[PDB]
Design a protein around this nucleic acid. Sequence first.
RNA 1: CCCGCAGAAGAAGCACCGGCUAACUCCGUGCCAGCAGCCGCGGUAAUACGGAGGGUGCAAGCGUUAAUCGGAAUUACUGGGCGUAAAGCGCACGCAGGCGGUUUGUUAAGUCAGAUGUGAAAUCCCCGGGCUCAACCUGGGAACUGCAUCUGAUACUGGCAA
RNA 2: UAGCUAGUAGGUGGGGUAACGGCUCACCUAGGCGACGAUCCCUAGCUGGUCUGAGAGGAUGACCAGCCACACUGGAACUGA
Lengths: 80, 157, 82, 129, 205, 123
Amino acid sequence: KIRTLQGRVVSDKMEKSIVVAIERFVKHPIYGKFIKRTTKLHVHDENNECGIGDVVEIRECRPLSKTKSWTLVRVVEKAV
Amino acid sequence: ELQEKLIAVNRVSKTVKGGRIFSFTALTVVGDGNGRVGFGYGKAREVPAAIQKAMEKARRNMINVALNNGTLQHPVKGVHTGSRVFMQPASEGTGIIAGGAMRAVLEVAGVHNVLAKAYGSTNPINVVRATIDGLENMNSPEMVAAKRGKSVEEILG
Amino acid sequence: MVTIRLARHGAKKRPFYQVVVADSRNARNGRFIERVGFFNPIASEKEEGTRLDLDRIAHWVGQGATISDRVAALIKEVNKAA
Amino acid sequence: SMQDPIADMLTRIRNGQAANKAAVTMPSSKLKVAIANVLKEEGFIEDFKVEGDTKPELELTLKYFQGKAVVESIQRVSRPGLRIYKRKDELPKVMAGLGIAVVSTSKGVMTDRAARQAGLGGEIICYVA
Amino acid sequence: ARYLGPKLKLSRREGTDLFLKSGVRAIDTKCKIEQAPGQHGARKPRLSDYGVQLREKQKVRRIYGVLERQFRNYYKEAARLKGNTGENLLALLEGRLDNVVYRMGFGATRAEARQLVSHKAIMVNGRVVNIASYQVSPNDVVSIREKAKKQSRVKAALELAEQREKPTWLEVDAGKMEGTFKRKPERSDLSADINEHLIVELYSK
Amino acid sequence: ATVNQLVRKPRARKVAKSNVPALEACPQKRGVCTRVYTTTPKKPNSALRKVCRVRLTNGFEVTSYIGGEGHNLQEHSVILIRGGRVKDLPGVRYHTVRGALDCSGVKDRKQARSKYGVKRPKA
RNA sequence: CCCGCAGAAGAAGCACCGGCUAACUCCGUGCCAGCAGCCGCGGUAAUACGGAGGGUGCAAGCGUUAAUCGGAAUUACUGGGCGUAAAGCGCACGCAGGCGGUUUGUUAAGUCAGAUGUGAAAUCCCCGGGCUCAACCUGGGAACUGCAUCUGAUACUGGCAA
RNA sequence: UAGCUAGUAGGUGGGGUAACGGCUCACCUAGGCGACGAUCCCUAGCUGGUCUGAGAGGAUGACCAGCCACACUGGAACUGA
């Protein structure tokens, strides 16, 4: 079974690459409040099958460029 | 028998036309040693009459305190005039671990193992009213089962 | 080369060797992969002097591992009856 | 603007026992009924009943043992601004065990004593002293 | 280390008798007891709440002859040890070797019985032990070596020791000069006078 | 308060400033002690306080109080300088260690002899 | 390490004693010399300066300086405040953000339970063992509040749908 | 300290490496990072731990042990697993 993460596309205009932000729901170490943090990754897609603002599921692969180590798995909740 | 214990003697003034005229205030706490405790303030012109006037006020202002085997029932707080006082039951804490004017009121009540800490102002008059407000608000498991659960084996567990 | 050797711990004039499985390049008290027992040479005639987990030691020599002269001596010293 | 209905329910009990009222009224909900059922089974309140179909309203008849009230103190622990979840070995005991802590666990809403014996924890809702 | 001074000035500062002398008589009434520990001895002080905690700790420390670094390590091991740390501090002070040999009667004072056990004379369980602060376990037998047996001092303290209350947590034969430490002394057997909770309160200050 | 505010800006620990800035984590400092002189104290006190300016070995030039009764400090007296202010002189934060390098001990001391650098009266 | 010989023989200081803070009198000096961590002492009868006697503390150490934390709830998550003590923006509107009434379905993210891998050893803690005891050394366990995966739980929170 | 970045960000292709990769080169795309603090400046080896504290924390990283970096200063490759 493959470790994989969800996340929404922030930008797509970079020629067979898209960037994806992952929101994790972490607790504060001191104060105990739950704070939304962000994990903007540069993920790889083949033929640009993703616009802006849609959920993309990704998994980790070999390094493909400088800060590109994730490829696409599928697309759910395609942008309207 | 009633464990008279003077805490502090102060010197207060009145400022009259001639000069300043002084008098003395005391603060003594009494108590049998099994859960009764009372403080009386008292003030007079000389020192031993100010302490003796505190003894008569302290005997007619005793309250009832519930203790389990010489220690408290539960962690309890007490607030009086900027004096926040915390006290723990301290299950064999082995000693009255309390500050000035908080230790003396706990010696005459008969309670022997407390971890106590006083926040805010540690004025000796106000911290004795803070502990006494903390001790009579403390309730025993017999009093809690009398109003909730209706069984002491079911209230505690 | 993994080696099963003695790392000298304990105080001055009171040595205590830990029978340990370490790479040969590392230091004596340095890194190791596993410890597999101890050896107390000054534990004289009282109740207990040495203990080695011989199943884990036989596992490492199956993977290929040289053993020191003392470790080979304590494995001999836990005899067939003693 | 009405962001914690649970703390508003405990505030009505706290102000009802202070004003020596016979009963208190609040708009009912599923969580308000379930924690009031915990308050009735322990002995802090008696005889809760919901009245209404489309706008339900929950009644709580408050208890007074002596002239003093029964609910000595009641706090709201897991605020909406700060939610607090505790483990099995991390459930607190109020007043060294003679108070209750209402915990919402995965098997329903119960006390701290009933959730320690179940062997599971959750969001601690309130401390009823 | 040790005091090496006048051992009745310490008993006068505390007021009570600390049994620092052998007592062939009773109160020596050669020392002016309960009247003056010094030049300003008739001037008795207010003796504040810190001072009453200090006097009780210095009273117990002067009975056994320990120092403060050694006494604070006794409190520190009594606090971590399970149970009541008030009587745990007294079980460790009565577990000392120089104290046990006093209570068996082989020494007339604590300082005399310390000089026997320090001078290689007293053995525990058939093995020669040299120090004063050896913690004896239950059912350990402490003997006297034959080179310092028949010492014009050890049996002379034994006919003095029938009046020393017969400590019944250790049995003494005193004819063969052996004795075993049966069990640890409880709080109900130690002099009914010392307030050990003042010592636990002083180190929490 | 208001715990969402503390996430955006945590509670700043107040920094405690040292009172002896001349000797950093240094227990004592050594100087060259130019211009030994005397000054008068602040108000309710009245004396001629024996004090000295001193240029330390780190480059700092501070003013240091010469404790005790009588001294031997002459303008190029290499001395040792420890902390401790006076509360009576404006600007003096340090004490000269008596009996350390050149500032010899006080004549005829019998009590508190480790302070002021006085040996035991043997004979 | 053990044994033998001789002889109480080779071996006690340092700070402090006005309040805090345990422990006080006398003489000298007279806002001088000086002390002082803070309050403050010293102006001719100083328990505060210097000396003497006495006492208290700790002990082969003892005090001083330096530094850190504690006391300090005096940056307060535990655990503080804002009418007048320091402190409500002059008053609005509003984006990101934070939070959100009520019912049902669904999801299992947060949450919780279990399991697995790991979280090196030493250290800390617990029960023991070895050094005459102790410091020290050491066996075993606990702990390493974690992270990751897997399997469930579905009350609350979140997503989604009505 | 509010904008920073042109091999910069991405693609394709050749070359290099023990190995992925702007690691390198040529050509195209115009991106990439940033108020969740980029960039710049000051300081600093990191950790297991140590000290303190009731705890939460605060301070710290000497010894022992793990990792990194350095070897007169700066630069470089050779030999070799």
